[PDB]
């Protein structure tokens, strides 16, 4: 079917529960060994949130290569995407040397430090100019260069340095500041509108490794925000738009990590947003 007839027809038929559990029915199911030994165990921000071994991120390094971070290689669409957990104490070092390795522009954050009184992921960038942070387990320097702070998100200039070889690069860190503590947003006009400016920051093109993106488990609203870009990129590069099915393209990202998109409030923000998405696109 279509999506936004579907899309009605699933609201008054009130059935959001049964077609998300058909999807959590119907995904891929692949190991994931390298995340359960126990020298990992630290590792880890949720003990039933894994990268598959195919698809994990391996970081450059012979004592211990492991982060719970996934590849999403999206073949048709030609997008692809880092989707990772927020970063714990013990991992932020491991964070940096990723975004460097894997020559990402941009670093997407959809999730607050403190949500619900609690932390949902370490402070890991710098706060002032004058304060930058050495990760001295990977040798790494980071220094924020500029901040922009708007109504639903900022957007931030960094600077990392490769201590051991003295190259740099400049990152952008984009963070949807107002995703409410429970639930999902009542209009998806700002999550929108977030998407269309890391779009045009460059960070998501070819030219560059492949953009990393998180939340507190790297699974529900950063499983939004890739399965939103893809399916838009999709109705732009077909002959018949209204031959996208969300949930499928749902279902090829699942191959690549568990869990995307955590509950059926979730999936029905995503048809939302993609629904809307495609009027402004047209072209409007
Ligand atoms: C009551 C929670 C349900 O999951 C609701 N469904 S439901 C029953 O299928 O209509 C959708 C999404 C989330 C929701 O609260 C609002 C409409
Ligand atoms: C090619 C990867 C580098 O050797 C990494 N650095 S780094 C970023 O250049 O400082 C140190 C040593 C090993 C490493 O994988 C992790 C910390």
């Known amino acids: 079917m279509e999506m936004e007839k579907e899309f009605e027809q699933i609201d008054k038929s009130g059935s959001w529960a049964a077609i998300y559990q058909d999807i959590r029915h119907e995904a891929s199911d692949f190991p994931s060994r390298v995340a359960k030994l126990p020298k990992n165990k630290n590792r880890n921000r949720y003990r039933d949130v894994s990268p598959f071994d195919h698809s994990r991120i391996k970081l450059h390094q012979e004592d211990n290569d492991y982060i719970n971070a996934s590849l999403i290689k999206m073949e048709e669409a030609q997008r692809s995407y880092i989707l990772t957990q927020g970063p714990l104490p013990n991992t932020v070092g491991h964070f940096w040397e990723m975004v460097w390795e894997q020559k990402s522009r941009g670093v997407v954050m959809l999730n607050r430090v403190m949500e619900k009184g609690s932390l949902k992921c370490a402070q890991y960038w710098p706060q002032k100019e004058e304060k930058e942070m050495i990760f001295e387990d990977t040798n ?56 269309f400016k890391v779009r045009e920051s460059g960070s998501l093109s070819p030219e560059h490794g492949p953009v990393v993106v998180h939340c507190s488990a790297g699974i529900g609203r950063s499983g939004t925000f890739c399965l939103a870009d893809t399916c838009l990129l999709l109705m732009d590069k077909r002959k018949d738009p209204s031959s996208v099915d969300i949930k499928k393209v749902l279902l090829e990202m699942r191959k690549f990590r568990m869990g995307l998109i955590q509950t059926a409030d979730q999936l029905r923000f995503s048809y939302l947003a993609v629904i809307e998405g495609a009027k402004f696109i047209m072209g409007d």
């Not at 901040?147 to 963070?175: A, P």
């Not at 409410?180 to 977030?194: C, R």
């Open 140 to 195: 790494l320097k980071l220094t924020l260069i500029s901040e922009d702070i708007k109504s639903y998100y900022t957007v931030r200039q960094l600077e990392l340095e490769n201590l051991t070889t003295q190259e740099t690069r400049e990152i952008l860190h984009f963070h949807y500041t107002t995703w409410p503590d429970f639930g999902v947003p009542e209009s998806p006009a700002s999550f929108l509108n977030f998407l």
